[PDB]
Amino acid sequence: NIPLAEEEHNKWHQDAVSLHLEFGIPRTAAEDIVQQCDVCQENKMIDHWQVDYTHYEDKIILVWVETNSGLIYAERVKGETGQEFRVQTMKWYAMFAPKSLQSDNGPAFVAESTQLLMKYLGIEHTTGIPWNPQSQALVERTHQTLKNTLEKLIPMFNAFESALAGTLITLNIKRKGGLGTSPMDIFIFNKEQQRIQQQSKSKQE
Amino acid sequence: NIPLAEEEHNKWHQDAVSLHLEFGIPRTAAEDIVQQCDVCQENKKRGIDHWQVDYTHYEDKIILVWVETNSGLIYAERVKGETGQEFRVQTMKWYAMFAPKSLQSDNGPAFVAESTQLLMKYLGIEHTTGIPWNPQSQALVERTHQTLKNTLEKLIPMFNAFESALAGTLITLNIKRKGGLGTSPMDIFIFNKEQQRIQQQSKSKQEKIRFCYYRTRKRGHPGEWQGPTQVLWGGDGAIVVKDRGTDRYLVIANKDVKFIPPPKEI
């Protein structure tokens, strides 16, 4: 099916997501179709994330945002210090399977043993001024409607971590788009599709 | 489910889409929940079919792009000139190709041309001209035209007709291109139209409501005719209704039930 997907790609030049999803080929193979197509590498406009700290009513919130699914995570934060962030990306590298990261150059992320925790855990960490309209619209609006839905939910709840969890529930889980796709729908699909190729990928590596 | 979906909303405060799809009530009911919920209306309007246009020049070829805002489904067609009338012809064709609930655009001439807005009125479409301000919109529209010129530049060598190449890009993006579970904008769109239509079918076919005025007896002495409000549960000779004042259900003697057709002034 990968063959007919590259014939179809040289013809119509789809995304690797679209050839993956069209032909059921592993997404790695579809990426190899596109990235080898010179039409697509001449013409250019998973588990990949961004972080920025944010304060919501004198409460720092470490805000993880997955660049593809739009799927978010958060936890209340005592300080923007690096060691706390190392603990948060240990916990968070537990709660997810991150491939790669973007972020600003802020102190926690650029910090040496934080970077060495990205190498230890093995995540690709790109530190720099985020330049991309792709991420920054989504992350900006994420802080917008996050601080919104916090402002909606926090009166209801005793704890602030309870209401914070509330927002994460609404956006990760209750919220949907497309055909009734929450972000978590997108992610669980992408991982469970990663499993079956993943049983092949140990042979492909 | 509509009261329960609303209960889920005032708790959680979801999208209209999410409450709708979750509880399967009609989506305008979910919209109305969000809209009758002060919490979401305090902090933030587009239905499903909402389009935005921008003319786009590529290779000295004027192209009249349409961009649906929600699905991200798009149309475009090459153009001779940006005029009112040619644009009127294009959008007539388009509205044969499209059922669009509302439009946005900027203040460009054909948009702001008089008979074009009159033609939005002939066609009854909500037209909004003005500086398009929405980060939801402008990122989508901008990336849409960038990706448009991108894929034009890919495909036009492969085709005799630049028009069939443009059709090519619409195929790639609206059909072939996918996201999430395999969703192209076309399939998202067709789905949304489908469930929306079916919202009409649901609402029309099922419920024959009735409404009434009502009154009550004090030492037997009947009340004035009141509300009026809605038949909740019908029974022969008496019913269930809500007291708006007490927010409370009540059983009223038909004699004291002044019947009304449902739609009221609406």
Added chain:
Amino acid sequence: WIENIPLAEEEHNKWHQDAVSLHLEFGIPRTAAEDIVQQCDVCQENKMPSTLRGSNKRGIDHWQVDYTHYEDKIILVWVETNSGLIYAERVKGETGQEFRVQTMKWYAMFAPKSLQSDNGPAFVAESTQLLMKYLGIEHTTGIPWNPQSQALVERTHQTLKNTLEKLIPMFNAFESALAGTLITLNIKRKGGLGTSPMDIFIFNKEQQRIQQQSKSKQEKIRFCYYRTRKRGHPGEWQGPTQVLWGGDGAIVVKDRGTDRYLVIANKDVKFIPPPK
């Protein structure tokens, strides 16, 4: 006339008339001419609610009551719904406690299974309600400004007071005369086939015997598909469920869709063969 209509409409908006005279004089179809006053405010407002209503035959041992003030005598009256055999007794006060005792008496006379009764406080009283509950009985509420749900007891207040006016001189006691009326209409009134209510209550107590109902379980069940014809063309068998009872040319069945008993003519039945 199709375009006479907005003027005729105006003439309702002006002169506010029936769908008919408007229909005819403007010479239109009448039905939207009714949709006028459907859509009128004015004429929509002040019309009356033509509504027939209904009373409940309801249940064996299902009951209905109201107290009486006959010649300044509180008389609380115990009156069946279905076959409408009755009882009553003179009372000194209407009160919930007193009432509760009265119903203990009368309840003990029978196995009365349920009730309709009005908003009178003694009917309504907390421990009264708890007493119905205590005994596993259904009170139901006669509602504001409907004696008519309380129909039969008021009816019988008529009948009775006529009979009182006969009998009471014949007795030492008003309440022996009360016994006399009670006697008569629960018995001596006999009609149709020349039967009292007492006949019918008691008969039906024999009729309502649980052991017989339990026993008929041994009789066979079959299920059956019913189905429905749209432009002549019958649906799938909808579903398949037991032939609750068969008649000649049709049966007893339930739609789970309505959860309600139903008929199917035996042509639109599938008979479903036995296990074997």
Added chain:
Amino acid sequence: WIENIPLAEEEHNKWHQDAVSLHLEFGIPRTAAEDIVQQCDVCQIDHWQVDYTHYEDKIILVWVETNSGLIYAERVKGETGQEFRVQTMKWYAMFAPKSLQSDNGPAFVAESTQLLMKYLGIEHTTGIPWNPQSQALVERTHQTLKNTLEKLIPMFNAFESALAGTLITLNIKRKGGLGTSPMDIFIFNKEQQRIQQQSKSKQEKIRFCYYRTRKRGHPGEWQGPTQVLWGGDGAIVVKDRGTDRYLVIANKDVKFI
């Protein structure tokens, strides 16, 4: 009603649908709608068919949906192969065809047409179109079409506008069945295809799992793997291979694999 009813009387003079369609649009009385159509002098899956036809020396390409009855069409300069090639490139852009009917005309039976049906993967069928089921729909489509242009076109400066209007009358505004226009039936079929496909995709997996059983409540050790035959609520089905007898197994007593 009586606010809708005039407005539909206004709109039929524009759009000239069935009385049915307006009854089913606006929720008016049908018989009044019928009174308009009489009193309106003017009226007084993914399997398709193409025909050309001429309306006032304007060649037109006519697509017709063999099931929903939906139509695409556009004004045409000529019956050439190449023009129609770009037409149906655009049509395949706006539509997602499986299949097609047509006659043996040159632009169809022209090769690069058919090669482009292969490049696009449509199964092109030319031949003497034989079918009353099709050709009656074809027939009424043409007669009622040019009827309908002849209604609308004087309202319109540009003819492409009016033609688009005819398409709108038929596709969009006109209804059939329960109030179902052609586009209604059409879009329904479209969305039904994909969910057929998704359903098959979920039918593909056939998962297996470990399981165990209780003795006086005390557990058995894990057993299997064995296929997940049918899921229930709180439990599944599995074939016991030991007894060759299927087992209802609590989900908590399972490890899905």
Added chain:
Amino acid sequence: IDHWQVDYTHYEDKIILVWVETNSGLIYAERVKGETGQEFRVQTMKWYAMFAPKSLQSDNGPAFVAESTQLLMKYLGIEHTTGIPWNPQSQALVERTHQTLKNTLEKLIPMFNAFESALAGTLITLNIKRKGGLGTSPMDIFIFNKEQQRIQQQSKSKQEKIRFCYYRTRKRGHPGEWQGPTQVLWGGDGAIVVKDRGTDRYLVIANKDVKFIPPPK
């Protein structure tokens, strides 16, 4: 699936609220300040963000059986089951879960500054890195499970025919009386699935102890 069990556990005077999924074996754990109901309400709000629990087990402990905890489980639409923990099916899993949990904590806590980092480490080893069978992780088994819990699966099952049948059951081989007619709940090979309407329980009946019922014809 999404049937979870809790036991608070103390590791080195650190209360650890240990979620254990009864089926995948997936877990969550976090260091906890106290066994308080309120803190537990916060933790289960957080964790109901991190997962989509349908249902719950736990012991009868104070936080769990707490009133507004119960109202919270209702508020979130989770079924909370409180009990003397009496099952070896789930309690074998929970027992070994806590044992291996403290084991891996003792492995990882030297390797990390924070105990939340190291406890996170244990969840990584056990949910992610730990693998079984063909090499799927318990987290993969959870993802897997959740992924096939889709409603578009339900649509196709609605599209199918069901056929109905009588059924009987054997005692010492002696065939019982026929029963139903009922749903063929699933067609098998040599048998099918049926619920007993009497005991409200799914059951299998060999096709000889079945009589399938023909369609409306």
Added chain:
DNA sequence: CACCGGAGCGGATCTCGCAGTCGACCACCCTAATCAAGTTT
């Protein structure tokens, strides 16, 4: 061409108010403002 269905209107069925302004004083059940009787930090 026969059979079933949506829309239409004449006829048939059921409930009720016009009787001047309506309350005045009972009896029962349920709810509530106000006063009197204790402690407790």
Added chain:
DNA sequence: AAACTTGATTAGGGTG
């Protein structure tokens, strides 16, 4: 010596 809860005896709302 302020406040805090509960029992007792007449004034209003739904029903004969």
